Amino acid sequence: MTLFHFGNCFALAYFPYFITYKCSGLSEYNAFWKCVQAGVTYLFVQLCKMLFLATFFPTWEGGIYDFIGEFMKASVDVADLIGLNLVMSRNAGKGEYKIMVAALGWATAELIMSRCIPLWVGARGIEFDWKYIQMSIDSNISLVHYIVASAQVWMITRYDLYHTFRPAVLLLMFLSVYKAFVMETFVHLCSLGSWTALLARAVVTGLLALSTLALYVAVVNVHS
């Protein structure tokens, strides 16, 4: 049973990334090595982020929920945007290709580092927990979030982006960076159940995706 549950969790986490990779046409462009390079960039950025946090921020000893600490972590999450920009600048191609390569490589690298080991050790345990399935869904939400963030970074980095659109892009980037902190604060404040928290994260990511898509379409059409 434990192997079957682990296989189901692994399939749910992994297959959406493969489907996105095949359907987006990245396989046609032989982008796999570019995605691997993006993942290496993610590993480098995450190491720099951990080093920055340890060097500059002492751990708060207050028992109460560390609102300052979570806000600081979200502020450090800007490094992920910088890394995504570096990956897109390093990668040549159409804007959609750059966005998809950066998002897919970053999300896959995060999935491998953060969820595979917990899936491997925990999901093979005797005890059944919904948390592994929730984490597998959360990886798909992270993948969508990274796609949105990469699209936003590409739009802001566009030389031709009109000044009217620029504040909207900056606001969307701000919301994307602070989304994790806001969601954790909201879940703590409302004592939300794990399923409700996952649903709320999905809804927020979907709304961000829809707004980013609408802005992207408007920006492309304004130049078409």
């Binding site: 049973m1 189901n8 399939a11 749910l12 359907c23 059409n221």
Partner: protein, 521 residues
């Protein structure tokens, strides 16, 4: 997961005969007795619902394990359920079972698990196959795992007996009366074998007698012309191993002259803490004119005159050498030809109360114990000082005022004995029980000594096993059908995701049209 303590049914070999459970490791799903198939399952039974037939049914079905849930208050449990369990308990111990049997004290989480398992077991019969599949898929299974390793034999367990002596006025040559009580408890679970009545009451009586005689022997005016030996024997429930070794050491060795020729009689105290009936068990009826007969006459006279409520009678059982286990401690002395008898409230040694985990401090009545102690003390004193020949009437109690038995000191001794289990496999040489018993005896008695018996390596009379106490962890689990349904759901989700990505162009065009319309308006 929920972790709770489980007490395993004891494993031991006596005279080469295997007893109890051989397995200590469990890794099976929990089920109730109601389940049709118990094979390779952990069967949960409550003591209130426990029946010997259902336990046999689980063994017949090769249950993976049996866990018996005990109510937290033994006194609270109805006395009929306890009586039935006590009667079944010797048969259960006598029967060797491969299936591990554990005892768990009730906990709210354990009860909730038991109820959930019972509901899951019942639901399977009541519903159509589609409903059963849906209920099974949504149901939570529990997996019971023991943290302990497989049990192993203890090759060098030592049973320790404590002896103390009071010398009479005239020295060692004077006739010696030996008062013996075994301190060890026995029951289905050693950790639950408090043995308050069996034989905590007897130990309490022995200690009170030791105090009273020590006080009498302190003063020359009250100093008797008898030697008194108080012996607290280990392994009484295991064929009186400690008594046998102590007899061998005293009688085989010429230096220990006290027992060879000077033993007036041996009084063994077993289960004297309860009941209004008192039975004197004798291997051979005392001959007229012998000191043992004098003691019997004094005991009957004191019971009839001072304590008419107490029904005293003599029970004669011939010793059967064929039987592996001696019925009474006095039989061991009788084999060595020492005159000995056992005083007990039990009509028969086979009573379940004598060897049950249900023998707890609440069962023992302090008033009954005090009365029996007074009767024994008066009878012994009357024999020792030959009061009846001196013309002292039977109705008059010697033990009044300064020599009155102390019911608070008896209650304290009973509480101390019952605070911890005194099973022979749990009583270590360095244990607090032995050290306290030796110190207490040493206060009132002279020449307190500890005798240690070890089973022979070539032919061990008794073998004990470890893993009597373990932690059992109940893990929540889902059945394989649930995983199959989840896999189907995941496949459908992946198909929907693939179609959504394939049709994303339609969404993109729709958004482009909506944005154009918004610009136009």
């Amino acid at each position: 997961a929920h972790e709770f303590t489980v007490y395993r049914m004891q494993q031991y070999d006596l005279q080469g005969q295997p007893y109890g459970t051989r397995n200590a490791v469990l890794n099976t799903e929990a089920r109730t007795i109601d389940a049709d198939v118990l094979s390779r399952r952990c069967v949960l039974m409550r003591l209130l619902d426990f029946s010997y037939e259902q336990y046999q049914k689980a063994l017949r079905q090769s249950a993976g394990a049996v866990v018996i849930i005990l109510p937290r208050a033994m006194a609270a449990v109805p006395q009929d359920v306890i009586r039935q369990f006590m009667e079944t308990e010797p048969e259960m111990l006598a029967m060797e079972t491969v299936v591990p049997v554990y005892f768990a004290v009730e906990d709210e989480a354990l009860l909730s698990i038991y109820e959930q398992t019972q509901a899951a077991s019942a639901a399977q019969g009541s519903a159509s196959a589609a409903e059963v599949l849906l209920h099974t898929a949504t149901a939570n299974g529990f997996q019971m795992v023991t943290s302990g390793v497989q049990s192993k034999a203890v090759s060098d367990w030592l049973i320790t007996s404590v002896e103390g002596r009071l010398t009479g006025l005239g020295g060692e040559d004077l006739p010696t009366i030996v008062i013996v009580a075994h301190y060890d408890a026995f029951g289905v679970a050693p950790w639950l074998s408090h043995g308050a009545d069996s034989n905590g009451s007897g130990i309490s009586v022995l200690l009170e007698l030791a105090r009273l005689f020590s006080r009498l022997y302190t003063y020359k005016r009250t100093h008797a012309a008898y030697n008194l030996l108080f012996f607290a024997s280990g392994g009484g429930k295991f064929n009186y191993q400690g008594t046998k070794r102590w007899l061998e050491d005293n009688l085989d060795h010429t230096d220990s002259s006290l027992l060879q020729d000077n033993v007036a009689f041996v009084l063994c105290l077993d289960t004297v803490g309860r009941g209004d009936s008192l039975h004197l068990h004798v291997s051979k009826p005392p001959r007229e004119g012998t000191l043992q007969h004098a003691f019997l006459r004094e005991l009957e006279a004191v019971a009839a005159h001072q304590f008419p409520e107490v029904r005293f009678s003599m029970v004669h059982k011939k010793i059967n050498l064929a039987e592996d286990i001696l019925a009474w401690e006095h039989e061991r002395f009788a084999i060595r030809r020492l005159p000995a008898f056992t005083l007990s409230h039990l009509e028969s040694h086979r009573d379940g109360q004598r060897s049950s985990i249900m023998d707890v401090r609440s069962r023992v009545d302090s008033k009954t114990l005090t009365r029996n102690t007074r009767l024994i003390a008066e009878a012994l004193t009357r024999v020792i000082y030959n009061l009846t020949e001196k013309g002292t009437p039977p109705d008059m109690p010697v033990f009044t005022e300064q020599m009155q038995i102390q019911q608070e000191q008896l209650d304290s001794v009973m509480d101390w004995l019952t605070n911890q289990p005194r099973a022979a496999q749990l009583v270590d040489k360095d244990g607090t029980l032995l050290s306290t018993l030796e110190h207490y005896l040493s206060r009132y008695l002279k020449e307190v000594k500890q005798h240690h018996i070890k089973a022979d390596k070539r032919d061990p009379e008794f073998v004990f096993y470890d893993q009597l106490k373990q932690v059992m962890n109940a893990y929540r689990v889902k059945p394989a059908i649930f995983d199959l349904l989840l896999a189907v759901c995941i496949g459908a989700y992946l198909g929907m995701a693939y179609t959504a990505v394939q049709h994303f162009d339609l969404l993109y065009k729709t958004v482009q049209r909506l944005l154009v319309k918004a610009k136009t308006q």
